[PDB]
Design a protein around this ligand. Structure first.
Ligand SMILES: Nc1ncnc2c1ncn2[C@@H]1O[C@H](COP(=O)(O)OP(=O)(O)O)[C@@H](O)[C@H]1O
Ligand SMILES: NC(=O)c1csc([C@@H]2O[C@H](CO)[C@@H](O)[C@H]2O)n1
Length: 179
């Protein structure tokens, strides 16, 4: 009765952008962004080397988010589409049995690091934060995904913004078609 779509991938791979596009052209379509569930700065930890721990599941209120998803799901039974976009989704076990479609955006190390630097975060990226925490954590996430039993459709984040949208858009109808 409801279609749940997952969109993950490394930071700045283009998740927000894909989510918004599908959102505009998809009927009865909602969006939940994993980033709205970050714990307050006062709750974040810094490792030995003085790096704030943001790229780990512990830096996000995931029980808050699952509750937000349950709300949507149950109020939906009253075809509803939910796009859940986030940089750390396919390694959070409670979601595995909820996905109807999973997409993973990939972007090279150089492009990613570049895009990242055009964005001022809060707290701002400390010196060598990207190499010292962001990249290492993504790689650690990519590895925690070697265990995935279901099917994740990999996307090329270097591709056109509309080419990615269209690739996903077609498929989503060739998936709703069997509905
Ligand atoms: N396909 C694309 N090609 C080039 N730049 C892109 C593309 N998609 C997004 N961007 C840019 O990359 C940066 C971050 O994109 P964003 O959608 O926020 O990705 P994410 O949600 O994974 O961090 C922004 O400058 C965005 O405009
Ligand atoms: N305040 C925040 O929410 C925050 C500070 S840095 C940050 C970044 O969010 C990215 C995932 O989208 C992750 O790489 C964090 O470094 N978030």
């Amino acid at each position: 009765k409801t279609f749940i779509i997952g969109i993950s991938g490394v930071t700045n791979s283009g998740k927000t952008t894909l989510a918004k596009n599908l959102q505009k052209h998809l009927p009865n379509c909602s969006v939940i962004s994993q980033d709205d569930f970050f714990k307050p700065e006062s709750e974040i930890e810094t490792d030995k080397n003085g790096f704030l721990q943001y790229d780990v599941l512990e830096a996000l209120n995931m029980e808050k988010m699952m509750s937000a998803i349950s709300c949507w799901m149950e109020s939906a039974r009253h075809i509803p589409i939910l796009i859940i976009e986030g940089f750390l989704l396919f390694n959070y076990k409670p979601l595995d049995t909820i996905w109807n479609r999973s997409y993973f955006l990939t972007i090279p190390y150089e492009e990613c690091k570049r895009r990242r630097s055009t964005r001022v975060y809060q707290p701002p990226d400390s010196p060598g934060y990207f190499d010292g925490h962001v990249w290492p954590m993504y790689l650690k996430y990519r590895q925690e995904m070697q265990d995935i039993t279901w099917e994740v459709v990999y996307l090329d984040g270097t591709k056109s913004e509309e080419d990615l949208f269209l690739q996903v858009y077609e498929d989503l109808i060739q998936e709703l078609a069997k509905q």
